[PDB]
Design an enzyme around this catalytic site. Structure first.
Site, PDB file in Angstrom:
ATOM      1  N   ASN A 156       0.825  -1.200   0.000  1.00 51.81           N
ATOM      2  CA  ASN A 156       0.000   0.000   0.000  1.00 51.81           C
ATOM      3  C   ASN A 156       0.868   1.261   0.000  1.00 51.81           C
ATOM      4  O   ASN A 156       2.073   1.196   0.263  1.00 51.81           O
ATOM      5  CB  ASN A 156      -0.957  -0.008   1.199  1.00 51.81           C
ATOM      6  N   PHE A 157       0.251   2.396  -0.318  1.00 54.47           N
ATOM      7  CA  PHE A 157       0.895   3.719  -0.255  1.00 54.47           C
ATOM      8  C   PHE A 157       2.036   3.957  -1.249  1.00 54.47           C
ATOM      9  O   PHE A 157       2.997   4.668  -0.941  1.00 54.47           O
ATOM     10  CB  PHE A 157       1.309   4.064   1.184  1.00 54.47           C
ATOM     11  N   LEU A 158       1.921   3.365  -2.437  1.00 54.81           N
ATOM     12  CA  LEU A 158       2.795   3.731  -3.541  1.00 54.81           C
ATOM     13  C   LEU A 158       2.567   5.207  -3.855  1.00 54.81           C
ATOM     14  O   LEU A 158       1.426   5.650  -4.002  1.00 54.81           O
ATOM     15  CB  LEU A 158       2.529   2.873  -4.779  1.00 54.81           C
ATOM     16  N   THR A 192      -4.264  -3.417  -4.114  1.00 58.99           N
ATOM     17  CA  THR A 192      -5.473  -2.885  -4.737  1.00 58.99           C
ATOM     18  C   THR A 192      -5.207  -1.528  -5.372  1.00 58.99           C
ATOM     19  O   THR A 192      -4.420  -0.741  -4.851  1.00 58.99           O
ATOM     20  CB  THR A 192      -6.636  -2.739  -3.734  1.00 58.99           C
ATOM     21  N   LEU A 442      -6.680  -0.288   2.779  1.00 60.57           N
ATOM     22  CA  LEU A 442      -6.739   1.150   3.039  1.00 60.57           C
ATOM     23  C   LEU A 442      -6.462   1.923   1.757  1.00 60.57           C
ATOM     24  O   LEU A 442      -6.721   3.125   1.669  1.00 60.57           O
ATOM     25  CB  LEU A 442      -5.751   1.556   4.137  1.00 60.57           C
TER      26      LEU A 442
HETATM   27  C1  MYA Z   1       5.978 -10.731  -2.164  1.00 56.91           C
HETATM   28  C2  MYA Z   1       6.156 -10.090  -3.550  1.00 56.91           C
HETATM   29  C3  MYA Z   1       5.955  -8.574  -3.484  1.00 56.91           C
HETATM   30  C4  MYA Z   1       4.750  -8.165  -4.330  1.00 56.91           C
HETATM   31  C5  MYA Z   1       4.925  -6.789  -4.962  1.00 56.91           C
HETATM   32  C6  MYA Z   1       3.571  -6.262  -5.443  1.00 56.91           C
HETATM   33  C7  MYA Z   1       3.751  -5.206  -6.533  1.00 56.91           C
HETATM   34  C8  MYA Z   1       2.448  -4.449  -6.793  1.00 56.91           C
HETATM   35  C9  MYA Z   1       2.510  -3.051  -6.177  1.00 56.91           C
HETATM   36  C10 MYA Z   1       1.545  -2.093  -6.873  1.00 56.91           C
HETATM   37  C11 MYA Z   1       1.221  -0.888  -5.986  1.00 56.91           C
HETATM   38  C12 MYA Z   1      -0.290  -0.733  -5.827  1.00 56.91           C
HETATM   39  C13 MYA Z   1      -0.673  -0.458  -4.373  1.00 56.91           C
HETATM   40  C14 MYA Z   1      -1.019   1.017  -4.163  1.00 56.91           C
HETATM   41  O1  MYA Z   1      -0.354   1.705  -3.389  1.00 56.91           O
HETATM   42  S1  MYA Z   1      -2.376   1.725  -5.031  1.00 56.91           S
HETATM   43  C15 MYA Z   1      -2.195   3.491  -4.595  1.00 56.91           C
HETATM   44  C16 MYA Z   1      -1.261   4.240  -5.545  1.00 56.91           C
HETATM   45  N1  MYA Z   1      -1.475   5.685  -5.373  1.00 56.91           N
HETATM   46  C17 MYA Z   1      -1.831   6.498  -6.365  1.00 56.91           C
HETATM   47  O2  MYA Z   1      -2.015   6.148  -7.532  1.00 56.91           O
HETATM   48  C18 MYA Z   1      -1.999   7.961  -5.944  1.00 56.91           C
HETATM   49  C19 MYA Z   1      -0.763   8.793  -6.304  1.00 56.91           C
HETATM   50  N2  MYA Z   1      -0.253   8.341  -7.605  1.00 56.91           N
HETATM   51  C20 MYA Z   1       1.037   8.344  -7.932  1.00 56.91           C
HETATM   52  O3  MYA Z   1       1.941   8.738  -7.193  1.00 56.91           O
HETATM   53  C21 MYA Z   1       1.320   7.812  -9.354  1.00 56.91           C
HETATM   54  O4  MYA Z   1       2.080   8.780 -10.091  1.00 56.91           O
HETATM   55  C22 MYA Z   1       2.032   6.435  -9.357  1.00 56.91           C
HETATM   56  C23 MYA Z   1       3.379   6.466  -8.631  1.00 56.91           C
HETATM   57  C24 MYA Z   1       1.145   5.385  -8.694  1.00 56.91           C
HETATM   58  C25 MYA Z   1       2.273   6.004 -10.810  1.00 56.91           C
HETATM   59  O5  MYA Z   1       3.429   6.637 -11.374  1.00 56.91           O
HETATM   60  P1  MYA Z   1       3.380   7.303 -12.858  1.00 56.91           P
HETATM   61  O6  MYA Z   1       1.823   7.539 -13.276  1.00 56.91           O
HETATM   62  O7  MYA Z   1       4.074   8.760 -12.750  1.00 56.91           O
HETATM   63  O8  MYA Z   1       4.147   6.402 -13.971  1.00 56.91           O
HETATM   64  P2  MYA Z   1       5.478   5.507 -13.652  1.00 56.91           P
HETATM   65  O9  MYA Z   1       6.557   5.903 -14.784  1.00 56.91           O
HETATM   66  O10 MYA Z   1       6.037   5.738 -12.294  1.00 56.91           O
HETATM   67  O11 MYA Z   1       5.082   3.955 -13.936  1.00 56.91           O
HETATM   68  C26 MYA Z   1       4.238   3.533 -15.034  1.00 56.91           C
HETATM   69  C27 MYA Z   1       4.094   1.983 -15.006  1.00 56.91           C
HETATM   70  O12 MYA Z   1       3.761   1.584 -13.635  1.00 56.91           O
HETATM   71  C28 MYA Z   1       2.418   1.025 -13.616  1.00 56.91           C
HETATM   72  N3  MYA Z   1       1.645   1.690 -12.548  1.00 56.91           N
HETATM   73  C29 MYA Z   1       1.331   2.987 -12.490  1.00 56.91           C
HETATM   74  N4  MYA Z   1       0.628   3.222 -11.383  1.00 56.91           N
HETATM   75  C30 MYA Z   1       0.500   2.074 -10.731  1.00 56.91           C
HETATM   76  C31 MYA Z   1      -0.120   1.707  -9.543  1.00 56.91           C
HETATM   77  N5  MYA Z   1      -0.754   2.610  -8.804  1.00 56.91           N
HETATM   78  N6  MYA Z   1      -0.067   0.423  -9.151  1.00 56.91           N
HETATM   79  C32 MYA Z   1       0.564  -0.487  -9.883  1.00 56.91           C
HETATM   80  N7  MYA Z   1       1.163  -0.168 -11.022  1.00 56.91           N
HETATM   81  C33 MYA Z   1       1.146   1.098 -11.470  1.00 56.91           C
HETATM   82  C34 MYA Z   1       1.802   1.334 -14.980  1.00 56.91           C
HETATM   83  O13 MYA Z   1       0.868   0.309 -15.338  1.00 56.91           O
HETATM   84  C35 MYA Z   1       3.023   1.330 -15.896  1.00 56.91           C
HETATM   85  O14 MYA Z   1       3.444  -0.020 -16.176  1.00 56.91           O
HETATM   86  P3  MYA Z   1       3.063  -0.788 -17.556  1.00 56.91           P
HETATM   87  O15 MYA Z   1       1.443  -0.916 -17.555  1.00 56.91           O
HETATM   88  O16 MYA Z   1       3.600  -0.136 -18.770  1.00 56.91           O
HETATM   89  O17 MYA Z   1       3.618  -2.295 -17.378  1.00 56.91           O
END
Ligand code: MYA
Length: 442
Positions: A156-158, A192, A442
């Site tokens: 959470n909290f990316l 999520t 959350l």
């Molecule tokens: C045990 C094993 C561990 C498991 C690990 C689990 C990993 C999962 C964790 C996931 C965390 C979720 C849990 C939460 O916290 S969800 C809550 C996230 N919060 C927000 O979205 C609010 C604020 N938003 C931001 O800060 C955005 O700018 C973020 C940083 C989210 C995107 O930054 P940005 O818009 O400036 O671009 P980029 O150059 O950095 O990256 C672009 C690439 O990244 C993929 N992308 C973008 N946003 C998300 C997102 N929210 N989840 C998953 N993936 C995301 C996107 O499909 C693309 O990839 P592709 O489609 O081309 O392939």
């Protein structure tokens, strides 16, 4: 090809005028995730079983200028760094009128969960200045995915600072936190998002119960319907000052054992759940010792019977917004319905029995009606719930408005079949099936 076909269709299902925060796929194509076209034959891991020894200790290279860092919740200066980074960047539109208001109180509750490791509260900083520019968090939980015990982590909290957004820095963060969790014998996660990624195991819809309609309207967080009056809406959403169901009181520590049984007994009807240890259960539903009402995070209530029997339990957490461009109001109190349990349908063999449902329903209506009163009294202005769980039983009757926001649930490195998100083909509330989504993120 059939992946993009079904993805566009999924996006069209979920189309709306992004409320709050909402952002061909070169990163996920290389990831242990269900693809859209992929029908699941058997549920289980995606990668071939591994050991910590296949995963290095060296953190993933960041570009020149950056460096990784743990965040010690308990270190004020560091904690503050997180919620400053979040509050300033966690809402897409800068001049949207509202801002997230993560408090120290809130993250102390959410980030300090049993088994929490400062190395899992990851961050990125500028080398020279020490400015925190990115954050992602992980916390340990064992998930229950259709009878199966999955030992996993909750991401959470990316958050990535707006000035260096779109810099493919999110993949690096994800990989790095995957690394740190793999290096501790955990191979799955629950994440999520509102955005559509390849592995939607479920989808629920946000809904809003107005607690202070006047203010909600004055802040543009709700509309005035056609042929309706301001007073009409005020009158419609009017709540009493005092809760109605006999027995209702706060959750004391002495209640843990009795409640914990009632909760896992109740929860064990859903297909995706978090399996709670009495330790982590106690931590979630009782917050920091004596906080004032404007700082209290988790609100947990119980129903005690004359004989001392605990019959029901519901909870809600506060997460306020800051309201910017508005002379009358500085902030907006937001309650979120969390976890709950009741024994009202326990003396029935089938959950979907018309009679078992009728019983569960008129009870959930009673409890969540009171949850609203309590939240209003806790000075919250709106009460959010998610069509998940059995929520669909009371949402409509309790004047939970339809809210134009979808929540998709994902499992990392694990395939599972679609799970009822409480929504019909057409996005209306599925009052017949309800939901098998048991976890509340959350
Ligand atoms: C045990 C094993 C561990 C498991 C690990 C689990 C990993 C999962 C964790 C996931 C965390 C979720 C849990 C939460 O916290 S969800 C809550 C996230 N919060 C927000 O979205 C609010 C604020 N938003 C931001 O800060 C955005 O700018 C973020 C940083 C989210 C995107 O930054 P940005 O818009 O400036 O671009 P980029 O150059 O950095 O990256 C672009 C690439 O990244 C993929 N992308 C973008 N946003 C998300 C997102 N929210 N989840 C998953 N993936 C995301 C996107 O499909 C693309 O990839 P592709 O489609 O081309 O392939």
């Amino acid at each position: 090809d059939k992946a993009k076909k079904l993805e566009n269709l999924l996006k069209l299902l979920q189309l709306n005028n992004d409320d709050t925060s909402k952002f061909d796929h070169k990163f996920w194509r290389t990831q242990p995730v269900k693809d859209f076209d992929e029908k699941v034959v058997e549920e289980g891991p995606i990668d071939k079983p591994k050991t910590p020894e296949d995963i290095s200790d060296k953190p993933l290279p960041l570009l020149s200028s950056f460096e990784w860092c743990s965040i010690d919740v308990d270190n004020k200066k560091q904690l503050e760094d997180v919620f400053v980074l979040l509050n300033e960047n966690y809402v897409e539109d800068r001049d949207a009128g509202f801002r997230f208001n993560y408090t120290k109180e809130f993250f102390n509750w959410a980030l300090k969960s049993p088994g929490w490791k400062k190395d899992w509260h990851i961050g990125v900083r500028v080398k020279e200045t020490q400015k925190l520019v990115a954050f992602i968090s992980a916390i340990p939980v064992t998930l229950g995915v259709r009878g199966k015990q999955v030992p996993s982590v909750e991401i959470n909290f990316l958050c990535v600072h707006k000035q260096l957004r779109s810099k493919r820095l999110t993949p690096v963060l994800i990989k790095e936190i995957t690394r740190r969790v793999n290096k501790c014998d955990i191979w799955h996660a629950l994440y999520t998002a509102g955005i559509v990624l390849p592995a939607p195991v479920s989808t629920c819809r946000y809904t809003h119960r107005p607690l202070n309609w006047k203010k909600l309207y004055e802040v543009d967080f709700t509309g005035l319907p056609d042929g309706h009056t301001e007073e009409d809406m005020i009158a419609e959403n009017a709540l009493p000052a005092k809760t109605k169901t006999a027995g209702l009181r706060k959750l004391k520590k002495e209640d843990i054992d009795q409640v914990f049984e009632l909760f896992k007994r109740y929860q064990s009807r859903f297909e995706l759940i978090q399996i709670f240890t009495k330790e982590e259960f106690e931590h979630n539903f009782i917050g920091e010792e004596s906080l004032p009402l404007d700082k209290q995070v988790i609100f947990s209530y119980v129903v005690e019977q004359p004989d001392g029997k605990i019959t029901d339990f519901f909870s809600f957490y506060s997460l306020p917004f800051t309201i910017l461009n508005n002379t009358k109001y500085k902030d907006l109190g937001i309650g979120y319905l969390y976890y709950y349990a009741t024994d009202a349908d326990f003396q029935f063999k089938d959950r979907f029995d018309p009679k078992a449902t009728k019983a569960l329903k008129t009870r959930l209506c009673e409890l969540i009606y009171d949850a609203c009163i309590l939240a209003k009294n806790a000075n919250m202005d709106v009460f959010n719930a998610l069509t998940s769980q059995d929520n669909t039983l009371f949402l409509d009757d309790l004047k939970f408005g339809p809210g134009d926001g979808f929540l998709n649930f994902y499992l990392f490195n694990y395939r599972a079949k679609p799970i009822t998100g409480g929504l019909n083909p057409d996005n209306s509330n599925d009052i017949k099936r309800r939901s098998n989504v048991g976890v509340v993120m959350l």
